[PDB]
Design a protein around this nucleic acid. Structure first.
Lengths: 98, 76, 108, 92, 83, 99, 83, 108, 92, 76
DNA sequence: ATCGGATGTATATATCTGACACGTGCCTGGAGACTAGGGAGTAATCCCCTTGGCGGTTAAAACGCGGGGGACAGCGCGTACGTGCGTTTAAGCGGTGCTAGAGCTGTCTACGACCAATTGAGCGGCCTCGGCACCGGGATTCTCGA
DNA sequence: TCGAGAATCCCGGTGCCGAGGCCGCTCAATTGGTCGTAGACAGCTCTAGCACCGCTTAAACGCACGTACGCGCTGTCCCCCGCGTTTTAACCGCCAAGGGGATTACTCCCTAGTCTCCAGGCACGTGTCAGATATATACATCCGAT
């Protein structure tokens, strides 16, 4: 009989693992490529200091972490356990973005 | 019928009026002898602020009156 | 003449009163600045720095470390109530988040 | 030569925790924090000076800016510390 | 010299492991497209600020002191890069 | 033979009525008494210009209206219609006020 | 002279009218206490800022400009009173 | 000297270039002010006020009124989406709110 | 001797809508809006000029501040109006 | 064995060295005849930046060398 | 509840490399001393304007009650997501190179500050007529028990 | 499905006070000169951002299965709403009064300005131990089986 953790057990372990560390979570080269192709529509030539790209990654990851915290709060408010896209839209409305 | 207009500056003039004259009429009289615009004067008699539409009798301005005058500035 | 004694020394402070004064002059905040204003501001900044550093050092000791880390600074700031009010809109590079799991998500 | 509060922060850290060290990233973060607080308080004091049409920023403006900015207990403690420093500077 | 897609590079396990940091235990299957629409509206609000900072400076390089000062302008202050 | 409106029609009519008008919905004298009571814990003697009182009332009305908008949105997101105290807390918690 | 219990001056019909303007069609019976609490804390913050402004101004009178500055420094700028 | 011509007249503007320049000088923004900065700022302010007044007058006309009211101003600002981003943190005295009811609340 | 923007707002109104009225409260709100935008743009321009180690606020700084504070097509239209006004002023 | 040290100022001195001498050794020699601190000099020979720990032979400094010298400032 | 294999977490030991802490030398920024002069402290004065009190009206608040709709717990289902595995893919790392341009310096020209005189725009005061608020009869329009 | 009935749109009439127009005077915006310097521009140098290549392997990905959870439905009951009746104090108008906000004038003293001196803060180099990493081992947790 093969070993199998029940669903929802590995998720909590991953939560505890990633709430203790400080490592940047998105892959650096894909993120930098995304930033460079986004900036292609404002200035034709840009050079994008590495420290600037690092700051962009840090800010984006912090923003996503906060947004997912608020999304989880909305999901728990809605008597759910999983999050759904409408949970993000509600959180982004109360925050006054959209 | 002469009443004395005592200004804030300590210079008191001698002004001859009529019992039926008005508060406004006094204002124009000083312009005739000093060139001071009527609207730059604030007349204070008996401690109450005189109004342009009132006469010199409604406040019982007896002769030899110490009329206290306040001068205003157009702009602060 | 008499010996030179620094403004910070004669005020009992460790932060640069002269540098605070120079920044106040060169900051376009006001045309003139008083004598006691740089001293007062340097004292306030020194007190706030000490307040942050005490908690940061305690948190660093909690992890069995003798050096301060941005993780420790983040932990101290987010654990103190009023520092969280000062820096609630401030994100810290390589600081992480506090360990939080909502009680509903815990297994029965 | 560049200028920062690294030395003063290190002296404060030695005063508070004599046995504790600190890293370069922490120096950067502490300099950023000091600059941010200085900018906030100075801007508040500048606004206060203009509202009363005063042309000078003094300890009174800095103190009321501290009251405006800092939260409850820290504002009180910081005002006490600053007042102590001001009296010590004026007397000595 | 031309980049076209560059948005699937923020992979599904990369949106996870960040939702995990946020503190979620279960994630739907349509969260990833929403989270990619975000972070594309975001950071596009940050560029076009960092640019026209570097453009005002007449540089053509986006320094870290542009991403900072674009933050603290968007209402978020970033430490250690850094002012 | 009493005419009786169904529960909800009068509420919708009141919503339509009160979204059209720009008057203040809180009684001026009770609000001023509340303001003066609140400020008694900062300074002993305060004078509280009537313009200042009106500005405070306008700000409080606008803030409460926005908070109730967010509370209603939370209630509808919870598949509900009535608003509840936990709806207000969630609106403030996301907004950045409930700590 | 001495005033107390004036937080009850925010009557139930006033809260219902505010919710009606906000767009709420049904209100539970526990909304009013929470609304009074949040109104009280918001008023305390704004009035504390106004009082410290009018105390730095060396006055005993809280002008409308003090309230305007108190609201502006919290991001709730108010047009229509001279600010 | 020749008859005085206003900077607003020679710039083809309605807002006071001279008064904007005086406000810039007396605001402690910088110790020196460029010549074209007040003209540019006055033009921008005039454009913005014209843009808002156009929508406010349109709202007043729609409301069968020949005067612009704070209610009309609020309606214009919160109906134009580009103005709403400018004044999203601004509350207008005697401005009210727009009529909007969530669809779920309607009778069915 | 109080000074405001009421006359200029009235002129702009008569230019855009040939016949429409302004209540006193509406004029006050317009003046408040004008002061708010002036302070916003001037503060951002001053911060810009200081960030680049400059002692002057020029049309370039004002234009970049307009770009920073104005969202969408409003920024484009404001920049167009500002540059047209500045070039017309320089032409005479 | 003499090589010429040509500074940015256009003043070229005549310096006698040894084949086994080092880049650092030249720096101290100029202090003996001019008082210039060694650390304020940037020696550029053959277009590559000389290093203090290297000798005068590793770069093949033939005689009658046009040694280009850059002078630095302590503070900007 | 209870046990135990299996998994992951945490702990003690050895080494070990680079970042942090302390010195040294120097040089510009901070300190010491005196002046000119305007900013602000301070004492009066007036009067706007805020506070307190009082009497009448009635709009609004408070209380009570009947019930219809809505909150909410319950139960089934089927489907969508978590978990684990083998495979693919490109991220990560190292090393090299080049040239685009960030950054620093020397000249100097245009540009903004500063000061004297003047006048025309705009702010203060009055004043008056029409937009606008209210009253009421009116027809229309939505709701609700049939 | 359709009238009964309450809400609301609507169409005149009447009286009121606020916006807009007019008059004046006065002060700050303008014109016109000087003058010191801010940065515009050219030159140059040295960093570093980009582009390339190969090699290792961690991360992503497609697949398959199961289970728990979101949803949809259903039944209870309870509580908030709508309506009527009684109470109250908000509100409007009026009146008395003093206090402290705003303004003006006098003056004094505190800060900007300038020169001169020197020492403490920055750059630098160096050495050394603190956290990182690997390795082996004990301990807490999970879930399937009883």
């Amino acid at each position: 009989k093969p070993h199998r953790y029940r669903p929802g057990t590995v998720a909590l372990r991953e939560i505890r693992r990633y709430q203790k560390s400080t490592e940047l979570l998105i892959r650096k080269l894909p993120f930098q490529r995304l930033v460079r192709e986004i900036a292609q529509d404002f200035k034709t030539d840009l050079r994008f200091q590495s420290s600037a790209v690092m700051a962009l990654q840090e800010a984006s990851e912090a923003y996503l972490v906060a947004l997912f915290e608020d999304t989880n709060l909305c999901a728990i408010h809605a008597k759910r356990v999983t999050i759904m896209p409408k949970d993000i839209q509600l959180a982004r409305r109360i925050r006054g973005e959209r | 019928m002469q009443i004395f207009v005592k200004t804030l500056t300590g210079k008191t003039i001698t002004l001859e009026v009529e019992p039926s004259d008005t508060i406004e009429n006094v204002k124009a009289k000083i312009q005739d002898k000093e060139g001071i615009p009527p609207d730059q004067q604030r007349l204070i008699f008996a401690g109450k602020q005189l109004e342009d539409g009132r006469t010199l009798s409604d406040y019982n301005i007896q002769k030899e009156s110490t009329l206290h005058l306040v001068l205003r500035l157009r702009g602060g | 003449r008499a010996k030179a004694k620094t403004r910070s020394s004669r005020a009992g402070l460790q932060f640069p009163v002269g540098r605070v004064h120079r920044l106040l002059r060169k900051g376009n905040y006001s045309e003139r600045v008083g004598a006691g204003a740089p001293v007062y501001l340097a004292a306030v900044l020194e007190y706030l720095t000490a307040e942050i550093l005490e908690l940061a050092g305690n948190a660093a000791r909690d992890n069995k470390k003798t050096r301060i880390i941005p993780r420790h600074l983040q932990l101290a700031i987010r654990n103190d109530e009023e520092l969280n009010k000062l820096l609630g809109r401030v994100t810290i590079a390589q600081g992480g988040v506090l360990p939080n799991i909502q009680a509903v998500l815990l297994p029965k | 030569r560049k200028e920062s509060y690294s030395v003063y922060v290190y002296k404060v850290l030695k005063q508070v925790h004599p046995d504790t060290g600190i890293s370069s990233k922490a120096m950067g973060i502490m300099n950023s924090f000091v600059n941010d607080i200085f900018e906030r308080i100075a801007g508040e004091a500048s606004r206060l000076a203009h509202y009363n049409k005063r042309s000078t920023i003094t300890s009174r403006e800095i103190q009321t800016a501290v009251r405006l900015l800092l939260p409850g207990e820290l504002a009180k403690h910081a005002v006490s510390e600053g007042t102590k420093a001001v009296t010590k500077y004026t007397s000595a | 010299k031309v980049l076209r897609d560059n948005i699937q590079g923020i992979t599904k396990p990369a949106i996870r492991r960040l939702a995990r940091r946020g503190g979620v235990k279960r994630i739907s299957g349509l969260i990833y497209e929403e989270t990619r629409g975000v972070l594309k509206v975001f950071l596009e609000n940050v560029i076009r600020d960092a640019v026209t900072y570097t453009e005002h400076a007449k540089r053509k390089t986006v320094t870290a002191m542009d991403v900072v000062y674009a933050l603290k302008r968007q209402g978020r202050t970033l430490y250690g890069f850094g002012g």
